[PDB]
């Protein structure tokens, strides 16, 4: 279990826009952002956001047991800091094309 407040702070720092400023007609291509099952905002460049969140988690800025999930098909981006999630470790393959 981890607090979700730093996650929300990081998301709001990197261009996430709240629900009160959201129009579904205007945002026909934005990604819904969920944090612990709560729809908290939207974003229009999910790739940079997920890259930044994953890099921060890999550097220790975010707790390693935080889940970062991007559903491209449903246009959703989910984050979980809940308690009770079963995880396992894996090696990381350098997937950067420019590297």
């Amino acid at each position: 279990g981890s607090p979700s407040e730093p996650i929300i702070n990081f998301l709001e720092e990197w261009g996430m826009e709240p629900l009160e400023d959201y129009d579904p007609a205007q945002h026909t291509k934005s990604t819904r952002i969920f944090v612990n099952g709560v729809w908290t905002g939207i974003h229009r460049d999910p790739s940079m956001l997920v890259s930044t969140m994953r890099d921060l988690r890999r550097s220790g800025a975010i707790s390693p047991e935080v889940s970062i999930i991007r559903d491209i098909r449903e246009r959703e981006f989910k984050i979980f800091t809940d308690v009770g999630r079963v995880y396992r470790p894996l090696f990381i393959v350098e997937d950067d094309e420019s590297k």
Partner: protein
């Protein structure tokens, strides 16, 4: 670390030998020829 929900969005090699592209006693590995390339 990855949990079961995040596993649905990743692509996992089984062994580090799988990252790079006729004996009757050695086991046979999957070809995985459906895709031209794997990342």
């Amino acid at each position: 670390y990855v949990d079961g929900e995040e596993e649905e969005t990743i692509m996992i090699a089984m062994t580090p030998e799988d990252l790079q592209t006729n004996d009757t006693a050695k086991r046979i590995k999957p070809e995985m020829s459906t895709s031209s390339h794997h990342t």
